[PDB]
Amino acid sequence: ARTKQTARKSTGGSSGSSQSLIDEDAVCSICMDGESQNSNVILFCDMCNLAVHQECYGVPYIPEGQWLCRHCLQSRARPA
Ligand SMILES: [Zn+2]
Numbered sequence: 460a461r462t463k464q465t466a467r468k469s470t471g472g473s474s475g476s477s478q479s480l481i482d483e484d485a486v487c488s489i490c491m492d493g494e495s496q497n498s499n500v501i502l503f504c505d506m507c508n509l510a511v512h513q514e515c516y517g518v519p520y521i522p523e524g525q526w527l528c529r530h531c532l533q534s535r536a537r538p539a
């Protein structure tokens with residue numbers, strides 16, 4: 460599963476840094492990035508845009524394969 464980690468800091472790697480940065484992170488649904496601990500890990504679906512921290516959703520362990528949320532894993536659950 461795709462897991463992105465981010466750490467908060469008063470003055471970290473920002474305000475230019477290398478005068479060239481291009482990246483687009485995900486947006487958790489359980490929280491509005493207002494209080495997710497100093498370091499958190501977001502999770503994006505492999506067939507969807509379900510972006511939720513594994514701590515926010517309550518995921519016991521992070522699979523070492525594809526991540527299909529209940530909506531998609533259910534869509535293909537019946538089919539074959
Ligand atoms: Zn969250």
Ligand SMILES: [Zn+2]
Nearest residue numbers: 504507528531
């Ligand atoms: Zn999904």
